[PDB]
Design a protein around this ligand. Structure first.
Ligand SMILES: [NH3+]CC1CCCCC1
Ligand SMILES: [Ca+2]
Ligand SMILES: [Cl-]
Ligand SMILES: [Cl-]
Ligand SMILES: [Cl-]
Ligand SMILES: [Cl-]
Lengths: 58, 250
């Protein structure tokens, strides 16, 4: 897989590696799930999420 | 903002209001607890640098509800390539004197990695621009925070569809050419924010245009992806005496 197509399947950030290797990464205040693509908050107020709306659909 | 709507209180929690001697100067974007991104041109006429205030958690300017947090601006960092009175490299990085406290009403916008921003975010058509700027060209500024969804144009297509500064690689166009919807005076420095898979990211800064909502013209926005590494390096740097810092770019 490649980062320039479909974000490499990553929810957030994507690095291409020597070989057919891709690594997804997450912003500070998030951790990468075992699927290797998804990012989940590790703190109360992660960047780029709107608490009153996250609470609205939680 | 022209032709938008009120941003419901708390739904634009990264929005910053910049004040000089208590008067409205500009907008800005919170990107973590101490750092705010704005527009270089906001500071072209500053005389006393020690009178700059940033306010987070702001919504209705006519009242205090207690969610507001004010901080002195300790540093203003502007790239060496910016020339006052002109439009290219229209970006400024502000250090707050004390961190803000993250709350339901005060949340940073994610500063994306460059590659992600160039390869993915740049192709998200619509993004949100916000501010307490003028509601109409030659009109009064907003008392409640306004927000506007604007489509991004490829620069070739902006130049083709527009009808005088250049559109450089450090800029992009977004909005409408029919005079209905635009960012306006007072909105300068504020966020152009882009949603991708559940999270919002900083892609632009309210920069300039041919007046406000001028028919045949689009809003011009600083292309933040060109500045990610520059910003990241400065955020790791020790503070320097004196508010203004001109820092080399690239
Ligand atoms: N978008 C057009 C406006 C022009 C005045 C400064 C903010 C941007
Ligand atoms: Ca208020
Ligand atoms: Cl002082
Ligand atoms: Cl240093
Ligand atoms: Cl000092
Ligand atoms: Cl000073």
């Amino acid at each position: 897989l490649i980062c320039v197509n479909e974000n490499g399947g990553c929810e957030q950030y994507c690095s291409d590696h020597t070989g057919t290797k891709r690594s997804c990464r997450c912003h500070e205040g998030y951790s990468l799930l075992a699927d290797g693509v998804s990012c989940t908050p590790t703190v109360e107020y992660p960047c780029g999420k709107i608490p009153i709306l996250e609470k609205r659909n939680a | 903002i022209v032709g938008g709507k009120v941003c419901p209180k708390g739904e634009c929690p990264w929005q910053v209001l910049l004040l000089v001697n208590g008067a409205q100067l500009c907008g800005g974007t919170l990107i973590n607890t101490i750092w705010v991104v704005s527009a270089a041109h906001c500071f072209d006429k500053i005389k006393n640098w020690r009178n700059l205030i940033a306010v987070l958690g702001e919504h209705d300017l006519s009242e205090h509800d207690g969610d507001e947090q004010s901080r002195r601006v300790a540093q203003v960092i502007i790239p060496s390539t910016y020339v006052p009175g002109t439009t290219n490299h229209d970006i400024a990085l502000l250090r707050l004197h004390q961190p803000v406290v993250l709350t339901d009403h005060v949340v940073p916008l994610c500063l994306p990695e460059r590659t992600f921003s160039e390869r993915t975010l740049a192709f998200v058509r619509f993004s949100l621009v916000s501010g307490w700027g003028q509601l109409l060209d030659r009109g009064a500024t907003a008392l409640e925070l306004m927000v506007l969804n604007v489509p991004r144009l490829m620069t070739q297509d902006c130049l083709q569809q527009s009808r005088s500064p250049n559109i450089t690689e450090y800029m992009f166009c977004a909005g409408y050419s029919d005079g209905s919807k635009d960012s306006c005076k007072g909105d300068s420095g504020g966020p152009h924010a882009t949603h991708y898979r559940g999270t919002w990211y900083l892609t632009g800064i309210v920069s300039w245009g041919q007046g406000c909502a001028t028919v045949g013209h689009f809003g011009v926005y600083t292309r933040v992806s060109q500045y990610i590494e520059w910003l990241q390096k400065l955020m790791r740097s020790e503070p320097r005496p004196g508010v203004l810092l001109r820092a080399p770019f690239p």
